[PDB]
């Protein structure tokens, strides 16, 4: 457990329907939500692969469960019944435990993605912006839409706004 979902970001956004993890920007020119395309696409692909692995890895042969025995073959009938319930318990325990653990893996994956996105933005902004608490940065300079899109694309230019940030800090 990393500490993002329910941690320092204590709420989700119903308005961000384009993706799973994203940004909310507010400047003098506009405000709005925007999903992170790369992380969302990678997460979608990975979860699809997880579901397909849980489902398609089960191989089955043509089986004819169900046998008929007369009253003089009660022992073979009980042996067949024993095979049946043993398989039943094995499969029940395995399926329940597998789903219980896979849910943990999925939730931890989403938390790690949110934390990594926050860390990426933090390491890009450096001291050009301050951490004001709930997963948000206040810029020490003027971020227009181009500056924000640079932050969300991964190509932020620290030397360009460093001087303005130093002046306002």
């Amino acid at each position, epitope marked *: 457990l990393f500490g993002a979902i329910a941690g320092f970001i204590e709420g989700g956004w119903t308005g961000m329907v*384009d993706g799973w993890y994203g940004y909310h920007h507010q400047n003098e020119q506009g405000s*709005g939500y925007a999903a992170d395309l790369k992380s969302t696409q990678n997460a979608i692909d990975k979860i699809t692969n997880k579901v397909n692995s849980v489902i398609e890895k089960m191989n089955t042969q043509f089986t004819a469960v169900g046998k008929e025995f007369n009253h003089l073959e009660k022992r073979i009938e009980n042996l067949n019944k024993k095979v049946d319930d043993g398989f039943l318990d094995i499969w029940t325990y395995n399926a329940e435990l597998l789903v219980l653990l896979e849910n943990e893996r999925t939730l931890d994956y989403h938390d790690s993605n949110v934390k990594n996105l926050y860390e990426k933005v933090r390491n890009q902004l450096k001291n050009n912006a301050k951490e004001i608490g709930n997963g948000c940065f206040e810029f020490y300079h003027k971020c227009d839409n181009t500056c924000m*899109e640079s932050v*969300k694309n991964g190509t932020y230019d620290y030397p360009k706004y460093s001087e303005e940030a130093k002046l306002n800090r």
Partner: antibody
Framework: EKLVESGGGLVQPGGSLRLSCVGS????????ISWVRQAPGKGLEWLAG????????FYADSVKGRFTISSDNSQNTADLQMNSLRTEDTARYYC????????????????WGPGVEVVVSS | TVIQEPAMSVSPGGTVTLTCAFS?????????PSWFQQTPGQTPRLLIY???SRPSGVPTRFSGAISGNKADLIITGAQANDEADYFC??????????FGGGT
């Protein structure tokens, strides 16, 4: 495979009207159902959208407080209810389906219905 | 609002680009441009979604890109059945999904 719309006709200004959209060949569970109107001569206009499995309902600023969209996945139906209809609401309405994987909309309206004409002439 | 060219035409077998822009902003991949085709008197058909992806029925000659702060739909080798009205839908918010004027 297909979406069939019904419930069009002629209503008076200030009236109310309900359109229904029934989908066949697929399940409504893993899609978003939106309503798009095309006025005579003008272009398309997105009105409302519903993701029933996520329980999310979105409305345009033009039809907020007037239109209400509900969905039933069991019967594969999607209904749009219009109140306080104005004269500028006369158009051909389309029940459109948008793809959603794992609860995330991908902005892909892939299947459109034939559409139903609605006239609000007095 | 969304600004689109009101009309343009090409000779058969040629190439054309259709442009879709914002009135005051910039078009990005995060705006999810989508391109629909509507033959007069028929229901619209989805040609391109997410700026570069075509459904399993659209011919290869239809392509999409983002260029010069606008969304571009490229038709290479226009046939006679490509004469229709082309619409662009841009996603700005959950409640704001703006269709183009038409072409």
């Amino acid at each position: 495979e297909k979406l069939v719309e019904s419930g069009g006709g002629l209503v008076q200004p200030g009236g109310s009207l309900r359109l229904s959209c029934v989908g066949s060949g697929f399940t409504f569970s893993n899609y978003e159902i939106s309503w798009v109107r095309q006025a005579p001569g003008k272009g398309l206009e997105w009105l409302a959208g519903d993701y029933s499995r996520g329980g999310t309902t979105f409305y345009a600023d033009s039809v907020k407080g007037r239109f209400t969209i509900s969905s039933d996945n069991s019967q594969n139906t999607a209904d749009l209810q219009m109140n306080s209809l104005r004269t500028e609401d006369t158009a051909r309405y389309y029940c459109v389906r948008g793809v959603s994987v794992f609860g995330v909309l991908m902005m892909a309206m892939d299947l459109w219905g034939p559409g139903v004409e609605v006239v609000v002439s007095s | 609002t969304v600004i689109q060219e009101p009309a343009m035409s090409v000779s058969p077998g040629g190439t054309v680009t259709l442009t879709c822009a914002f009135s005051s902003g910039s078009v990005t991949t995060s705006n999810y441009p989508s391109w629909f085709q509507q033959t007069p008197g028929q229901t619209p058909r989805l040609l391109i979604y997410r700026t570069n992806s075509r459904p399993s029925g659209v011919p290869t000659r239809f392509s999409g890109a983002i260029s010069g702060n606008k969304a571009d739909l490229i038709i290479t080798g226009a046939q006679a059945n490509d004469e229709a009205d082309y619409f662009c839908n841009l996603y700005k918010s959950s409640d704001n999904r703006i269709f183009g004027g038409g072409t």
